Design a protein around this ligand. Structure first.
Ligand SMILES: *[C@@H]1O[C@H](CO)[C@@H](O[C@@H]2O[C@H](CO)[C@@H](O)[C@H](O)[C@H]2NC(C)=O)[C@H](O)[C@H]1NC(C)=O
Ligand code: NAG
Ligand code: NAG
Ligand code: NAG
Ligand code: NAG
Ligand code: NAG
Ligand code: NAG
Ligand code: NAG
Lengths: 256, 360, 101
């Protein structure tokens, strides 16, 4: 039941100092720690995607590179998860992350994904994929898309483990990527062990009951992580409150 | 230390005191999400050997002890691994294959065997890594009129490959003429019934068999047997093993408020200084056990053979005992009088022989 | 070999009573499916002892050939089956065997 319904436009914005996450699960208090990891560089070019469905294939699959920074200002019900893999068909394994109002299901199977996958609302996954065979992983837990509010995620695929980091922020009367530091916290480490080179965002569409689906829009920001050395400031309570990118400018390099 | 039989008056550093570890603690996370072994070795209904049931086991803790204590077993033969090491090993996937056969055929569920069951119903490879478990099931699978719901494949064109299943009911064509679907001369239905009755001989009574096959792949192994989590002991020098992080030190109470996602703690110089207990969400200050430089304060051997021992940096309660800022001095008596320095101790304290006295 | 568990559990080695009637002829039964039984209204006599040895010789003969296919589960001729029980009846009646037990 694969149907093409979403069109997508793209613009370019500045990352500012968004995208910092905790590189490990180690408590450090009132220290300066220099770590080399896959980080989103400061003031980097981030692509802002607007996906519009009004009531042709114009929603291509994005590359994954070395990791993806995802942000959204939308409500928790419009964006409902993501798709990860290489070929996105029945010949290779793929990872499907689907959130709903009660829980999140993370599942790795051989999905035959649609070109324009979307969850239609009960909820049906027949517009996301046509078949799912040889399924090798399932993980159900509490959801990480809950309820103006900026939602930030960091996805990494390192040595068999898919790491997801998340943070929510009460933004207000400012550009969607605000100033200041909001360190993302480790949310899940998934023992997946698959090759991921491409990814795609999942949206939810409502049936119209009157142009089969209700018209809608979703805006999200995508940035790409790079191997970078960061210097993180840990305060008295162990929270990362500040960071300097070691290779951004000579002042920060001197600080590093 | 000085490689001489006569020691001149002074203080000499001779050894290093250490507090030996007394106990070992291996506290690990509260065991939960136990693999469903209570649903494979204890089902209300088993399967025929031709359509043998396979359950994949992943992302859980493998508590094989219930399997061990789940019935008296006619055979617990393990091919490739020893029955004990299982729990301390971690495999990627565990396949549990369940079926019912007759006692005489239990020997056929093994690598390198032949028969009706091995060739046409269930075949194990010659490099099989796993265990075979069988037990008697007269009270559950035998009826007096005859239990005709357990079937086996008697006729097949070719032998089965390892870990293969055939569910076909195709009429076995043993002759030259086509069968045409209808049973008739030289055309036999391949699935025959195991007519179990309670009065059969031991070799023919129904036996339930579960075959556990362990496989490792390139993926991270997520079926890791439960690691014993011993009780927690505080305020002593104990070898600690917390979530795979090992060391040796005292575990004192901590005032540090960790964030919910953090598990370990590190110093400015990247040395562990704190940890979170995985059984009870409390924070402990890991502090290494006391060590000190044992220094010996002695006058000349010409005058006397009395010695005093200074444990540098060690409080006196953790080893004529006097406490100094330099450390604990044993064998010298503090005198409130002040004299010139004869043997330097440190922090304003000096020692002399008059017995050996220590003074400011 | 020893005697099976089902032999001890299922055989009726004593006359059951007046209310339940049974054939009193000594007979060894090879039910099959590993089931071997003796129908014998045993009493206490030297005779019934020798006859019990005879019928257990019959049952041992039936047990040895059980592995064979169904239509060959018999004696090689009609004489062997009773001979292998009568040799036990011969050996058990000797003065040496009676002094041994
Ligand atoms: C939200 O997602 C959860 C998990 O996918 C759904 O809960 C499952 O519902 C199915 C019904 O087909 C049951 O078989 C499962 O046992 C349920 N799983 C759990 C963990 O509860 C739930 O129905 C979804 N809700 C909506 C509104 O779509
Ligand atoms: C972001 O990338 C686009 C095309 O890749 C480029 O035209 C644009 O100038 C970039 N933004 C900045 C701030 O350089
Ligand atoms: C994947 O599925 C197909 C049929 O569903 C099967 O032939 C193939 O062997 C399966 N591969 C694995 C690795 O399970
Ligand atoms: C991952 O997939 C891409 C695209 O198919 C392929 O080019 C690459 O070699 C793969 N990497 C590995 C390690 O298999
Ligand atoms: C740290 O914790 C203390 C005690 O709970 C709290 O008063 C303080 O606001 C927290 N934050 C900082 C930045 O000190
Ligand atoms: C195992 O089987 C016995 C059989 O009656 C039953 O009493 C018991 O509850 C079962 N245990 C489990 C854990 O299923
Ligand atoms: C660990 O198990 C014990 C025993 O049931 C329980 O009291 C304790 O609260 C558990 N801890 C956690 C973090 O669940
Ligand atoms: C069965 O025979 C063996 C010797 O082969 C003997 O040791 C054993 O006790 C016998 N069984 C019984 C129940 O007497």
């Amino acid at each position: 039941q694969c149907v093409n319904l979403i069109t997508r436009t793209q613009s370019y914005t500045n990352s500012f100092t968004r995208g910092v996450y905790y590189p490990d699960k180690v408590f450090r208090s009132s220290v300066l720690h220099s770590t080399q990891d896959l980080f989103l560089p400061f003031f980097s070019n981030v692509t802002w995607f607007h996906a519009i469905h009004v009531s042709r294939f114009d929603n291509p699959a994005l590359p994954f590179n070395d990791g993806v920074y995802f942000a959204s200002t939308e409500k928790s019900n419009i964006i409902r998860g993501w798709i990860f893999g290489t070929t996105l068909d029945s010949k290779t394994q793929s990872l499907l992350i689907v959130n709903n109002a009660t829980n999140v299901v993370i599942k790795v199977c051989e999905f035959q994904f649609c070109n324009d996958p979307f969850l239609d609302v009960m909820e049906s996954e027949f517009r996301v994929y046509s078949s799912a065979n040889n399924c090798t992983f399932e993980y159900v837990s509490q959801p990480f898309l809950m309820d103006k509010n900026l939602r930030e995620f960091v996805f990494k695929n390192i040595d068999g483990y898919f790491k997801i980091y998340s943070k929510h922020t009460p933004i207000n009367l400012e550009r969607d990527l605000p100033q200041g530091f909001s360190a993302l916290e480790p949310l899940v480490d998934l023992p997946i062990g698959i090759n991921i080179t491409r990814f795609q965002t999942l949206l939810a569409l409502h049936r119209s009951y009157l142009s089969g689906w209700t018209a809608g829009a979703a805006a999200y920001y995508v940035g790409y992580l790079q191997p970078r050395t960061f210097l993180l400031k840990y305060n008295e309570n162990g929270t990362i409150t500040d960071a300097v990118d070691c290779a951004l400018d000579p002042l920060s390099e001197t600080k590093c | 230390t000085l490689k001489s039989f006569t020691v001149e008056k002074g203080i000499y550093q001779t050894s290093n005191f250490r507090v030996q570890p007394t106990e070992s603690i291996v506290r690990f996370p509260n065991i939960t999400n136990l693999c469903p072994f209570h649903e494979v070795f204890n089902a209300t209904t088993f399967a025929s050997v031709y359509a043998w049931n396979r359950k994949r086991i992943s992302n859980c803790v493998a508590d094989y002890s219930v399997i061990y204590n789940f019935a008296p077993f006619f055979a617990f033969k393990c091919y490739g691994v020893s029955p004990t090491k299982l729990n301390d090993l971690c495999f990627t996937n565990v396949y549990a294959d369940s079926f019912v056969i007759r006692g005489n055929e239990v020997s056929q569920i093994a690598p390198g065997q032949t028969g009706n069951i091995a060739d046409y119903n269930y075949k194990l490879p010659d490099d099989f890594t796993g265990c075979v478990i069988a037990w008697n099931s007269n009270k559950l699978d035998s009826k007096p009129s005859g239990n005709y719901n357990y079937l086996y494949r008697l006729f097949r064109k070719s032998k089965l490959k390892p870990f293969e299943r055939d569910i076909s009911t195709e009429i076995y064509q043993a002759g030259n003429k086509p069968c045409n679907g209808v049973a008739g001369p030289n055309c036999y239905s391949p699935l025959q019934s195991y007519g179990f009755r309670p009065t059969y001989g031991v070799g023919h009574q129904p036996y339930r068999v579960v075959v556990l096959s362990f496989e490792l792949l390139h993926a991270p192994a997520t079926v890791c047997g439960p690691k014993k989590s011993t009780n927690l002991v505080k305020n002593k020098c104990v070898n600690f093993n917390f979530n795979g992080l090992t060391g040796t030190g005292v575990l004192t109470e901590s005032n540090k408020k960790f964030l919910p996602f953090q598990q370990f703690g590190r110093d400015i110089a990247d040395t562990t200084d704190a940890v979170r207990d995985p059984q009870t969400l409390e924070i402990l200050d890991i502090t290494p056990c006391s060590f000190g430089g044992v220094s010996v304060i002695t006058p000349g051997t010409n005058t006397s053979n009395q010695v005093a021992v200074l444990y540098q940096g060690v409080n006196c309660t953790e080893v004529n005992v006097f406490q100094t800022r330099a450390g604990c001095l044993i064998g010298a008596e503090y005198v409130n009088n002040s004299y010139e320095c004869d043997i330097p101790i440190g922090a304003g304290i000096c020692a002399s022989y008059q017995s050996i006295i220590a003074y400011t | 070999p020893n005697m099976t568990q089902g032999f001890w559990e299922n055989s009726m080695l004593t006359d059951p009573g007046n209310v339940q009637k049974a054939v009193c002829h000594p007979t060894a039964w090879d039910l099959g499916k590993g089931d071997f039984r003796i129908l014998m209204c045993t009493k206490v006599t030297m005779d019934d002892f020798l006859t019990a040895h005879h019928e257990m010789g019959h049952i041992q003969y039936d047990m040895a050939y059980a592995a064979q296919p169904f239509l060959l589960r018999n004696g090689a001729n009609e004489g062997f089956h009773e001979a292998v029980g009568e040799i036990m009846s011969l050996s058990a009646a000797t003065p040496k065997h009676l002094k041994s037990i």
